[PDB]
Amino acid sequence: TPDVFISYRRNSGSQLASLLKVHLQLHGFSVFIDVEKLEAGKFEDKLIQSVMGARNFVLVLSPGALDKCMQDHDCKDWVHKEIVTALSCGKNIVPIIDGFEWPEPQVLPEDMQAVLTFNGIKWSHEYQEATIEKIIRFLQ
Amino acid sequence: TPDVFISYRRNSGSQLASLLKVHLQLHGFSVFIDVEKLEAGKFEDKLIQSVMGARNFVLVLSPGALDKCMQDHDCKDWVHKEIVTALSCGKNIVPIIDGFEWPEPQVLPEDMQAVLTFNGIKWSHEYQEATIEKIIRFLQ
Ligand SMILES: C[C@@H](c1cc[n+]([C@@H]2O[C@H](COP(=O)(O)OP(=O)(O)OC[C@H]3O[C@@H](n4cnc5c(=O)nc(N)[nH]c54)[C@H](O)[C@@H]3O)[C@@H](O)[C@H]2O)cc1)N(C)C(=O)NCC(F)(F)F
Ligand SMILES: C[C@@H](c1cc[n+]([C@@H]2O[C@H](COP(=O)(O)OP(=O)(O)OC[C@H]3O[C@@H](n4cnc5c(=O)nc(N)[nH]c54)[C@H](O)[C@@H]3O)[C@@H](O)[C@H]2O)cc1)N(C)C(=O)NCC(F)(F)F
Secondary structure, eight states: OSSSSEOOOTTTTTEEEEEEEEHHTTTTTEEOOOOOOOOOOOOHHHHHHHHHOSSSSEEEOTTTTTTTTTTTTTOOHHHHHHHHHHHHHEEEEEEEESSOOOOOGGSOGGGGGGGGGGEEEEEOOOGGHHHHHHHHOOOO | OOOOEOOTTTTTHHHHHHHHHHHHHHOOOEEEEEHHOOOOOOOOHHHHHHHHHHEEEEEEEEETTGGGGOOTOOSSHHHHHHHHHHHTTTOOOEEESOOOOOOOOGGGGGGGGGGGGGGEEEOSSSTTHHHHHHHHOOOO
């Protein structure tokens, strides 16, 4: 079971999320990201089990990354599905802030509002190695 | 003196450029990117000199990356300046295509139109490892 699951938006967070996978793998962590570890079968099943098997949940807060979550009242958006699982299993959630504006809780679905209550890490283009060291201090 | 100079747009390519840095150093290339290796002094000469010392010139073509070069007569846009140096020095230009649309050459200033004649490498989120290896094979 991989120890770090990376959840992100294919849209605005694909590059950071891959740059995080590499960096954590360089420091020895076993990393799940979809385009490399999501393999055969029913992905709904397997993605949820990958969040369930990972002690660490790294969530890439790229600009507008929770917009598709807002008014996803039937829990059919995939960042929404991943966050709820992580909160449900008590995972060490670690958000990564990259030009992300914090929603008010009320605009998000109730089952994922708790994600705003975790200390996030601001991504610094100018000080990436320090940001990586900080992200790794946060990992368990 | 570094072997590889990375040219990029801070607002669209900052992540892929940093992703390219980490991977290339991993493979043992000495990589120049401004955030890590631009240092004291007048940047307008430190920058041009570093393009001149690197055999390889890697150009991150994120979306819109050459836009601010358009109509830049007096060569004051930095992507424009870095590109013209690579062309005038006969550098090993390896463009990286990240959702970039090829402009018609005549929208670009005359002194960088030739940059379009080089073989670009398409960045594949799904096949990042394959993409990195192809980049290495292009490098001298
Ligand atoms: C459903 C989709 C998916 C997987 C993981 N996630 C997690 O949820 C977050 C990202 O979600 P996003 O909201 O940012 O983007 P999306 O919702 O649009 O994703 C779906 C989009 O990909 C394309 N698309 C759709 N269907 C398939 C498919 O069968 N096969 C392939 N190759 N592409 C497919 C299409 O373009 C579509 O629109 C992340 O945290 C993921 O971990 C979300 C969605 N999926 C199965 C794959 O990708 N499989 C390839 C991979 F990942 F294994 F390499
Ligand atoms: C002029 C600027 C620069 C350097 C290299 N390049 C190459 O040219 C391409 C970039 O393309 P861009 O179109 O994005 O450039 P820009 O005009 O937008 O940059 C302006 C933005 O940078 C910030 N800004 C501006 N002025 C300073 C400054 O004195 N001091 C610090 N700390 N930040 C500064 C600010 O945020 C601003 O708004 C790349 O290929 C670079 O290699 C372009 C511009 N510069 C000196 C730095 O950055 N130095 C910090 C560094 F790079 F060492 F980390």
